[PDB]
């Protein structure tokens, strides 16, 4: 309808809708898949530190919760009966790039990293308190991810 | 190759024919095969002393077969004959008779009909453009399968 | 030429013609070297079961004769001036029959080779590996019907 | 009387006599492939070491040609003439 | 008016998923030929103490 | 370069950019537009399949996931018949991706419709085709990776039981964990869908 | 990410696992040491799954040395019901375990040339694991020359020669411990030449990492030993010495170019991970222990051949305890009780 | 030519219906192949497999029945003069049920070797191999659902 | 030109040409390298091997002019007048004898070694052999057989 | 609606910020990942070491910060209506910094790997190492200050 | 121009010869250079049989004469006023002569490697060598019988 | 604008600037990796030459800086209003400079850490080492020469 | 011996660039163009696959006369088939270029 709204505009909202949910979900299904075997490997030498080794599934979750913030709250903010400007897809495309990729990093890292960690905490239990302060220091990249999708959405509402 | 079964005939004369027949049909320049005939020849002459001398590494087996060669050759001259080439080259040994008009600029095609072509070989006319070759090649691609 | 027999067609129908007998062939001729390594390993082993264990090789043969006559009977029906509805469907007719068959000759052409190689123990695997065999390659008849009934309807419904 | 190995070997002998029929009435064209390829190649070399040779000058042309004329006789005895034939 | 429809096609949509169809085939193509034999299982070596 | 296929990648990843120079250097450079090429395309085009597609992918990662994990309940089983009952749930773990597809097709079904003659090519139902179609692929691919996670879980904790029987229950939070990730993307599939009225 | 690993060796897995679950710790070998009499060691083990095969079969004619026997037949019979479920590369990959085997194999065979013990008999107490039924020694010209070629056609060793045509015409002490030398320098270097390039991602650090350990610990038995009860140039030591250690590859040369008991300290001291020529017993005992510890950690993967490598050395340590305890209760010299390891 | 009916149509139906046999006949070759040689290597050393547990190779092709019934079926609502809204729903139909038997058919496969490889040492739970190997074969009556339905629509508007 | 006879047409018939030999070529040097290496390695040990094994080698040649029979047949029907019918006719021909070829090609070598293995070690295997090796060549022909077929008779109805 | 304002500008403008948190969030990873492994080999022989080691991974998230910091700067001067001029810019300098945060994070990781263990033997290391980690990470201020030094022009001489 | 002669008619001429000599040099050096590397390898203990084991070289050498007239003949005909239709036969006929040159030289390698192994031990087996390895050339010079065939027909008028 | 101007100009020099510095990063942590873990790994044996052994680094160092010093120079020469020339030089400087630092690291890196290994065994190496270095940072200085010209013939004439 | 006769396909190339670049312009026919393009290449991955076959054969026969002296003069005659080969592409390049030269329109 209008020379800056094309009919193709909810195309490069929806991109974003999609993108930001998909790589979260893979970024947390290889980070529990990685925890799985740390956490197994460990069970038949050390059947009691399970339960304060289940710090990394937790984290990895957050990947999830993430991603499904970042799209739902897109998702409905567009409508059928208006074109928006197409300038507000792309906002959307960045948004569904910058988190679907952010998740997808932390993800990695927590995985291979508390899964050597849980490996050979059976040893001692001095190794926790390093063990979760590096895992945060991970986490920070989805929380910045996080951050910034919200902050360019809020940018061009 | 092998041997044969108790009388069983030998390709004695066919080795003797064909083999040199077909290695003269292969290629008939006539510079070539008077040169490859003239070290077969200074070999016949010179296998007065060179029966007995040392036959050197590579000399061995040419000293074997020093009369092949020259069938090779002789067979070679006279499958060449035909051809009307010496070093891609001819002096119109026959007369053909061909039609030409009183004038003619080249980069025309010209046709000349036959009164009687060579009696023995092909004339010179095959010496043109590429209709002499593309005529060449389909009348011998046929002689070869007859033979053969 | 006209919307719905433009000049082109006949590509579609000269490469459906040409599919069926491609692919099916392929997978025919590698399920039987796979299956004659083994008949050929077992051999040196036992000269005396050598014409027994023969089956193999030969239900992977089927699969081309399916080939070809789908094949012919599509090629039987072959002219310029063809609704492009004609075209359409050889090619997908072709490829269903061309791939259906290389994937029941990889599949004959392993397991007829792995049964015969262990049947020199035991004498009754013989029989047991018929029905399987026979089953794999019963899985390739069951393209042809389907290519079957799509050429029939390849005309069954002429408009124009 | 019969016996199997005797009637797969006529068999086998029928097929391959009659595929063998063929296959040496088509081996002939190597031949005439041969002959037409030293023609061509014999042809090429003339022109390329000929017309060379031809350039018009009785100071240094001399010279040139005497140098082109044993060349060219190096080429005919040696590579035109050995792997030919061999 | 019309697409490019000489350096590319101009009815181009009836070949985006033929794409997708060839990569499907393809990946089938590839993780069938891989497939395992187990030659071991019926092969051995006869001891007096494994066999 | 090691193999043919980063060597074809290599090709065409140089090929497109030489192909958009060419035109770009002709005084052209527009003639290729995004726009116009989604407006051609019928928008019924990529509801027709994606309602498919989801699916597919869906059941796919439901396949995977017995995939991995039969071959480890059992393998285990021979050890102790002490398990199978106690690890079927894992594998219902697994089918239950297979109903969460299930829903996604049974539901797009009515929004299909035939429109009139025109119109269709305005942006009241293209929209939805497009809402459609990426809400499908979205809840595929997270069901296909949600059925990867549960799989590889299962497998492991067929072969952790035997360790010791009082570790089953101990393991049993990861699988759904995993599961939690199926569930989100229905939520996000169903929300993606049912904004879009239907075609008109 | 391991995810593939799981389409053709999955029961490979499940079975190693079950087996090692199968592992008897030492609460079960201090019950076993208390027995004394060869009839109760043997139906104190009846109650464990290690037994049931063992007791129950002889006449109470149980010896140390048929206790070893019995007890090597079941861990053979599992690694050849494995081979019986096997797989491609899974076959492909044992024969290299089975190379270690039959190069000693061969050499017994070699050096019975002059006294001519049968085949038969030397797999009465020799490796079975290198048996290959294509071996036709005691059948025609038993002679190391002659029998050369017929080897090198038998069993595809030959790319394991390091120019084994000269000198292997001695048929003596010499020749017959250098070929053993050389032949395991040759066998671990292509071993780990092949595992660094062809195998699944999470065997790539734990089969070069054990394998290095393994040849450490084997080049410093052939320096530590070298000058025990013979002597040598050091261009023969350098040769023997493996290319690569895999740990360190400069001690190396430093052990080779040493003749004395102290040129050698400094090269295994200076890693500071295992004492130089110190905290030993029975030396090969500190290498089990200290193996052990590794393969311990290489039973916690799931998705790698390391899992098979750890516990055939798992099963033959158990063996290894066994016999250390039927040693002293057959024998009846209480002093090996103490003498035995279990991280299981 | 028209939105009422472009003139290319039926290439999408022809190439729809083939695509479901065309995967079906993958995804119960697969199997098929892998069951066959489970069941050689096993039964060698225990010679009285032939009845009790080889029902897996015969359900190879029970799945494989999806490729002919959907194939037929959807070739009976097919023509020219189509409309594109019915003209690439069929499509959707036929790879929609392919992919689905190549996916089912791949796991019963692999748990069908799984199971004929444990219940030689093991003829004892091999109740249980059965009754969770259908487990796997049911997927593919979603593909036999979603095509019904796709049919039906398609056979609600027939130009 | 007309539509029906464009200008690129016979692009088509003069590339099915080349191609038409080249995939059977290339079959028939593949199993002759194969056959030859295995023959060249048994020779030597049994010493009358090399005339009772001449057939795979002789195969090859069938193979070859299997390629040349269809390929020059079509020389004949090229041109710059004929349809664009004719371009497609050709190279249909063309790639089914070669793909076909190639097929037979692919697996007379691999046949032909494992045949040739045990030929030091079964003396009586000296027909054995051919019984695959002719089997095996049940589709050496479809292939030929349909390019006849095709080009004989589309080689007319210019409309 | 100008040749310098194509409705197509604003693409790069909302692409730029986002591409630059992609890299230095992938190098970071990578290399806090592979410092984590090493810094796991080593704590548990000599333990008691763990603030002392622990630096690199600070190090790593410095640039995880650089690429937040010019993203949201980017993000503050975005424009819907703006020139195409800036947008190109815009790009560029994302692409810049994502790109030399890539570099530095491989260096990052792989020479802490070895880093890590030698600590624990000799002492006399720690400050020769970080020393290599600081020449490395210099490469990330390199890259910064470009990036900032292009930001900066594109904030004129915008139609 | 005409739609009988475009501008770029002769490109496709032109390239053909170079293709044609080019793939036929390609296949020559890769055999002739596999199989004298053999020979040499294996002449050292066995020096006295040197000049007889030189057969398989001169042999491959052919291949090269046949790619080199080929390739002059078809140079013989080139021109810009020429017909399309003399513009691809002439490749068609190029890239057959050099494929199946290709596949010659692969062959004639791969069978070469192998046959001085076998005449390694005993001089009988001269015979054998040949004429296992006497198969290629036929291979190699079907190509270029199909060559001359199709550039006959080059010659006739554009029109 | 104007064909003298077009409106995408400054692609150019925005792709080159980052080009500029960009590959020389990743050249500078590709050497300082390389060099660092030899020399961190040797060091521990015997800390005698880390304020000794330190070059390579610095060298590296100086390499990603020589790549900041042209990217600079050039990007102080930008605008809108600039012809597709300057963005043609401006792309031929960076991509000029980046590889050729990237050239640079990768021989650093290769050197230094067999550099490092063999020094400890002479202490008298570096009188070597730093000689066949020099030639790194040479190649840096004709990778630097060559691009500002690229700058001093941009102005004579533009639009 | 090896490395000299491997030099001259140096020789080869230089010699064919130089007679292109007698014969360059701006106003000629495509057609000598399209001629020029094809003649290059000819010429240039021949000289390649040349060094390639003689490449893997120096190496060879270098060590087997270390202990068959007279293995000198069997080895030379299978280097020579390398330049042989080599050889064709400049004689073929030569003719094209000649010929590129009077069939012209502009």
């Given at each position: 309808?209008?020379?800056?709204?094309?009919?193709?505009?909810?195309?490069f909202?929806?991109?974003?809708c999609?993108?930001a949910?998909v790589?979260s979900?893979?970024?947390?299904?290889i980070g529990?898949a990685?925890?799985?075997?740390g956490?197994?490997?460990?069970?038949?030498?050390?059947?009691?530190?399970?339960?304060?080794?289940?710090?990394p599934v937790?984290?990895?979750?957050?990947?999830?919760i993430?991603?499904?913030?970042?799209?739902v709250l897109?998702?409905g903010?567009?409508?059928?009966?208006?074109?928006?400007?197409l300038?507000?897809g792309f906002?959307?495309?960045?948004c569904?790039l910058?988190?679907?990729?952010?998740?997808?990093?932390?993800?990695?890292?927590?995985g291979?990293?508390g899964?050597?960690?849980?490996?050979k905490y059976m040893?001692?239990?001095?190794?926790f308190?390093?063990?979760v302060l590096?895992?945060?220091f991970?986490?920070?990249?989805?929380?910045?991810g996080?951050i910034?999708?919200?902050?360019?959405?809020t940018?061009?509402? | 190759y092998g041997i044969?079964?108790?009388?069983?005939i030998?390709?004695?004369?066919?080795?003797?024919?064909?083999?040199?027949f077909?290695?003269?049909?292969?290629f008939?320049?006539?510079?070539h095969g008077f040169?490859?005939?003239?070290?077969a020849?200074s070999?016949?002459?010179?296998?007065?002393?060179?029966?007995?001398?040392?036959?050197?590494?590579i000399?061995?087996?040419?000293?074997?077969?020093?009369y092949?060669?020259?069938?090779?050759?002789?067979?070679?001259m006279?499958?060449?004959?035909?051809?009307?080439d010496?070093?891609?080259?001819?002096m119109?040994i026959f007369?053909?008779?061909?039609?030409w008009?009183?004038?003619?600029?080249?980069?025309?095609?010209i046709?000349?009909?036959?009164?009687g072509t060579?009696?023995?070989?092909?004339?010179?006319?095959?010496?043109?453009?590429?209709?002499?070759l593309?005529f060449?090649?389909?009348?011998?691609?046929?002689?070869?399968?007859?033979?053969? | 030429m006209t919307?719905?027999?433009?000049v082109?067609?006949?590509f579609?129908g000269?490469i459906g013609?040409?599919?069926?007998?491609i692919?099916?062939?392929?997978?025919?001729?590698?399920?039987?070297?796979?299956?004659?390594?083994?008949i050929?390993?077992?051999?040196?082993?036992?000269?005396?079961?050598?014409?027994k264990?023969?089956?193999?090789?030969?239900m992977?043969?089927?699969?081309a004769?399916?080939?070809?006559?789908v094949?012919?009977?599509v090629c039987?029906?072959?002219?310029?001036?063809?609704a492009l509805?004609?075209?359409?469907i050889?090619?997908?007719?072709?490829?269903?029959?061309?791939?259906?068959?290389?994937?029941?000759?990889?599949?004959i052409?392993?397991?007829?080779?792995a049964?015969?190689?262990?049947?020199?123990?035991?004498?009754?695997?013989?029989?047991?590996?018929?029905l399987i065999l026979?089953?794999?390659?019963?899985?390739?008849?069951y393209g042809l019907?389907v290519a079957?009934?799509?050429?029939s309807?390849?005309?069954?419904?002429?408009?124009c | 009387?019969?016996?199997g190995?005797?009637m797969?070997?006529?068999?086998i002998?029928?097929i391959?006599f009659?595929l063998?029929?063929?296959?040496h009435?088509?081996?002939?064209?190597?031949?005439?492939?041969?002959?037409?390829?030293?023609?061509?190649?014999?042809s090429?070399?003339?022109?390329?070491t000929?017309?060379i040779?031809?350039?018009?000058?009785?100071?240094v042309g001399?010279?040139?040609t005497?140098?082109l004329?044993?060349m060219?006789?190096?080429?005919?005895?040696?590579?035109?003439?050995?792997?030919?034939?061999? | 008016?019309?697409?490019?429809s000489?350096?590319?096609?101009?009815?181009?949509?009836?070949?985006?998923?033929?794409?997708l169809?060839?990569?499907?085939?393809i990946?089938?193509?590839?993780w069938?030929?891989?497939?395992?034999?187990?030659?071991?299982?019926?092969?051995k070596?006869t001891?007096?103490?494994?066999? | 370069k090691?193999?043919?296929?980063?060597?074809?990648?290599?090709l065409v990843?140089?090929?497109?950019?030489?192909?958009?120079?060419?035109?770009?250097?002709?005084?052209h450079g527009?003639?290729?537009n995004?726009?116009?090429?989604?407006?051609?395309?019928?928008?019924?085009?990529?509801?027709?399949?994606?309602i498919?597609?989801c699916?597919?992918?869906?059941?796919?990662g439901?396949?995977?996931?017995?995939?991995?994990?039969g071959?480890?309940?059992?393998?285990?089983?021979?050890?102790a018949?002490?398990?199978?009952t106690?690890?079927?749930?894992s594998?219902?773990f697994c089918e239950?991706?297979?109903?969460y597809?299930?829903?996604?097709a049974i539901?797009?079904?009515?929004?299909?419709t035939?429109?009139?003659?025109?119109?269709?090519?305005s942006?009241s139902?293209?929209?939805?085709?497009?809402?459609?179609?990426?809400?499908?692929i979205?809840?595929?691919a997270?069901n296909?990776?949600?059925?990867?996670?549960?799989?590889?879980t299962?497998?492991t904790?067929?072969?952790?039981?035997?360790?010791?029987?009082?570790?089953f229950?101990?393991?049993?939070?990861?699988?759904?964990?995993?599961?939690?990730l199926?569930?989100?993307?229905?939520?996000?599939?169903l929300?993606?869908?049912?904004?879009?009225?239907?075609?008109? | 990410?391991?995810?593939?690993?799981?389409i053709?060796?999955?029961?490979?897995?499940?079975?190693?696992?079950g087996?090692?679950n199968?592992?008897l710790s030492?609460?079960?070998?201090?019950?076993?040491?208390?027995?004394?009499?060869?009839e109760?060691?043997?139906?104190?083990?009846?109650?464990?799954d290690?037994?049931?095969?063992?007791?129950?079969?002889?006449?109470?004619?149980?010896?140390?040395?048929?206790?070893?026997?019995?007890?090597?037949?079941?861990?053979?019979?599992?690694?050849?019901?494995?081979?019986?479920?096997?797989?491609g590369?899974?076959?492909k990959?044992?024969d290299?375990?089975?190379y270690?085997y039959?190069?000693?194999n061969?050499?017994?065979?070699?050096?019975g040339?002059?006294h001519?013990?049968d085949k038969?008999?030397i797999?009465?107490?020799?490796?079975?694991?290198g048996?290959?039924?294509?071996?036709?020694?005691l059948?025609?010209?038993?002679?190391?020359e002659?029998?050369?070629?017929?080897?090198?056609?038998?069993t595809?060793?030959?790319?394991?020669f390091?120019?084994?045509?000269d000198?292997?015409?001695?048929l003596?002490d010499?020749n017959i411990?250098i070929?053993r030398?050389?032949?395991?320098?040759?066998?671990?270097?292509d071993?780990?030449?092949?595992?660094?390039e062809?195998?699944?991602?999470?065997?790539?650090?734990?089969?070069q990492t054990?394998?290095?350990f393994?040849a450490?610990?084997?080049?410093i038995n052939?320096?530590?030993?070298s000058?025990?009860?013979?002597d040598?140039?050091?261009?023969?030591?350098?040769?023997?010495?493996?290319?690569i250690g895999?740990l360190?590859?400069?001690?190396?040369?430093h052990?080779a170019?040493?003749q004395?008991?102290?040129?050698?300290?400094a090269?295994?001291?200076n890693?500071?991970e295992?004492?130089?020529?110190?905290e030993?017993?029975n030396?090969?005992?500190?290498?089990?222990?200290?193996?052990?510890?590794?393969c311990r950690?290489?039973?916690?993967?799931?998705?790698?051949?390391?899992?098979?490598?750890?516990?055939?050395?798992?099963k033959?340590?158990?063996?290894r305890?066994?016999?250390?305890?039927?040693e002293?209760?057959?024998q009846?010299?209480?002093?090996?009780?103490?003498?035995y390891?279990?991280?299981?």
């Amino acid at each position: 309808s209008n020379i800056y709204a094309p009919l193709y505009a909810p195309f490069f909202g929806f991109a974003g809708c999609a993108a930001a949910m998909v790589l979260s979900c893979l970024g947390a299904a290889i980070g529990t898949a990685k925890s799985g075997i740390g956490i197994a490997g460990i069970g038949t030498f050390k059947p009691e530190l399970i339960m304060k080794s289940l710090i990394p599934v937790v984290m990895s979750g957050i990947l999830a919760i993430y991603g499904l913030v970042v799209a739902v709250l897109i998702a409905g903010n567009l409508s059928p009966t208006e074109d928006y400007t197409l300038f507000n897809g792309f906002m959307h495309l960045s948004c569904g790039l910058c988190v679907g990729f952010a998740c997808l990093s932390s993800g990695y890292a927590i995985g291979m990293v508390g899964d050597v960690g849980v490996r050979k905490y059976m040893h001692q239990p001095r190794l926790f308190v390093g063990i979760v302060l590096i895992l945060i220091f991970s986490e920070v990249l989805g929380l910045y991810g996080m951050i910034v999708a919200l902050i360019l959405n809020t940018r061009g509402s | 190759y092998g041997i044969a079964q108790y009388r069983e005939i030998n390709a004695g004369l066919p080795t003797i024919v064909t083999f040199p027949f077909m290695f003269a049909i292969m290629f008939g320049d006539m510079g070539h095969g008077f040169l490859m005939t003239l070290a077969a020849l200074s070999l016949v002459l010179n296998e007065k002393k060179i029966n007995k001398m040392k036959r050197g590494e590579i000399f061995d087996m040419a000293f074997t077969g020093r009369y092949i060669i020259l069938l090779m050759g002789v067979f070679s001259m006279y499958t060449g004959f035909l051809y009307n080439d010496i070093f891609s080259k001819t002096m119109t040994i026959f007369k053909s008779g061909w039609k030409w008009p009183d004038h003619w600029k080249k980069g025309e095609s010209i046709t000349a009909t036959s009164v009687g072509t060579y009696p023995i070989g092909l004339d010179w006319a095959w010496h043109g453009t590429e209709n002499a070759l593309l005529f060449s090649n389909s009348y011998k691609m046929k002689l070869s399968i007859l033979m053969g | 030429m006209t919307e719905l027999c433009p000049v082109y067609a006949p590509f579609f129908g000269a490469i459906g013609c040409a599919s069926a007998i491609i692919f099916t062939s392929l997978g025919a001729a590698y399920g039987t070297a796979k299956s004659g390594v083994g008949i050929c390993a077992t051999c040196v082993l036992r000269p005396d079961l050598l014409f027994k264990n023969i089956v193999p090789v030969i239900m992977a043969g089927i699969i081309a004769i399916y080939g070809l006559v789908v094949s012919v009977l599509v090629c039987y029906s072959l002219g310029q001036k063809q609704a492009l509805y004609t075209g359409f469907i050889q090619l997908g007719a072709g490829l269903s029959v061309g791939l259906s068959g290389l994937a029941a000759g990889f599949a004959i052409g392993i397991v007829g080779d792995a049964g015969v190689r262990g049947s020199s123990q035991q004498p009754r695997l013989f029989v047991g590996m018929i029905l399987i065999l026979i089953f794999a390659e019963v899985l390739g008849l069951y393209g042809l019907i389907v290519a079957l009934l799509l050429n029939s309807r390849a005309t069954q419904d002429v408009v124009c | 009387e019969d016996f199997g190995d005797i009637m797969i070997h006529q068999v086998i002998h029928t097929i391959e006599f009659c595929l063998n029929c063929v296959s040496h009435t088509a081996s002939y064209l190597r031949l005439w492939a041969l002959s037409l390829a030293h023609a061509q190649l014999s042809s090429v070399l003339w022109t390329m070491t000929i017309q060379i040779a031809f350039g018009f000058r009785g100071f240094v042309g001399v010279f040139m040609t005497v140098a082109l004329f044993a060349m060219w006789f190096a080429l005919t005895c040696a590579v035109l003439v050995l792997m030919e034939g061999t | 008016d019309i697409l490019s429809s000489i350096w590319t096609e101009g009815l181009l949509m009836c070949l985006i998923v033929s794409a997708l169809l060839l990569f499907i085939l393809i990946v089938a193509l590839s993780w069938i030929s891989n497939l395992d034999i187990t030659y071991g299982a019926l092969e051995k070596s006869t001891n007096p103490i494994k066999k | 370069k090691f193999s043919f296929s980063h060597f074809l990648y290599y090709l065409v990843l140089i090929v497109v950019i030489v192909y958009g120079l060419y035109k770009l250097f002709t005084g052209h450079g527009s003639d290729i537009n995004f726009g116009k090429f989604l407006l051609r395309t019928s928008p019924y085009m990529w509801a027709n399949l994606g309602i498919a597609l989801c699916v597919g992918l869906s059941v796919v990662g439901a396949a995977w996931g017995i995939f991995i994990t039969g071959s480890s309940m059992i393998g285990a089983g021979v050890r102790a018949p002490r398990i199978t009952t106690k690890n079927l749930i894992s594998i219902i773990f697994c089918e239950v991706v297979a109903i969460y597809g299930l829903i996604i097709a049974i539901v797009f079904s009515s929004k299909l419709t035939v429109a009139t003659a025109e119109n269709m090519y305005s942006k009241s139902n293209l929209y939805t085709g497009y809402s459609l179609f990426w809400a499908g692929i979205t809840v595929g691919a997270s069901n296909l990776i949600c059925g990867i996670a549960v799989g590889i879980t299962g497998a492991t904790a067929a072969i952790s039981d035997a360790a010791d029987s009082a570790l089953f229950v101990k393991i049993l939070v990861i699988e759904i964990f995993g599961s939690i990730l199926g569930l989100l993307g229905l939520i996000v599939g169903l929300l993606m869908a049912g904004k879009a009225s239907e075609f008109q | 990410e391991g995810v593939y690993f799981n389409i053709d060796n999955g029961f490979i897995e499940g079975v190693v696992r079950g087996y090692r679950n199968g592992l008897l710790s030492n609460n079960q070998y201090i019950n076993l040491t208390q027995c004394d009499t060869l009839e109760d060691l043997k139906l104190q083990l009846s109650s464990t799954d290690y037994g049931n095969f063992l007791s129950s079969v002889s006449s109470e004619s149980l010896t140390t040395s048929l206790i070893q026997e019995y007890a090597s037949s079941k861990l053979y019979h599992e690694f050849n019901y494995i081979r019986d479920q096997s797989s491609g590369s899974t076959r492909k990959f044992m024969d290299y375990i089975t190379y270690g085997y039959m190069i000693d194999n061969v050499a017994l065979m070699i050096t019975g040339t002059i006294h001519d013990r049968d085949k038969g008999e030397i797999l009465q107490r020799c490796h079975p694991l290198g048996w290959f039924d294509t071996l036709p020694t005691l059948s025609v010209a038993t002679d190391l020359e002659s029998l050369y070629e017929t080897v090198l056609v038998d069993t595809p060793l030959a790319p394991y020669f390091k120019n084994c045509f000269d000198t292997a015409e001695e048929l003596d002490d010499m020749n017959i411990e250098i070929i053993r030398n050389k032949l395991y320098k040759a066998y671990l270097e292509d071993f780990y030449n092949f595992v660094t390039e062809e195998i699944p991602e999470p065997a790539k650090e734990c089969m070069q990492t054990l394998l290095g350990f393994e040849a450490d610990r084997r080049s410093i038995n052939i320096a530590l030993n070298s000058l025990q009860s013979s002597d040598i140039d050091p261009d023969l030591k350098s040769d023997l010495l493996p290319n690569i250690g895999k740990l360190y590859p400069l001690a190396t040369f430093h052990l080779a170019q040493a003749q004395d008991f102290e040129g050698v300290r400094a090269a295994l001291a200076n890693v500071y991970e295992y004492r130089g020529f110190l905290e030993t017993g029975n030396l090969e005992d500190h290498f089990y222990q200290l193996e052990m510890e590794l393969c311990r950690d290489a039973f916690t993967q799931q998705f790698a051949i390391s899992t098979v490598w750890a516990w055939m050395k798992s099963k033959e340590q158990e063996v290894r305890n066994i016999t250390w305890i039927a040693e002293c209760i057959a024998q009846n010299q209480r002093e090996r009780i103490n003498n035995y390891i279990s991280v299981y």
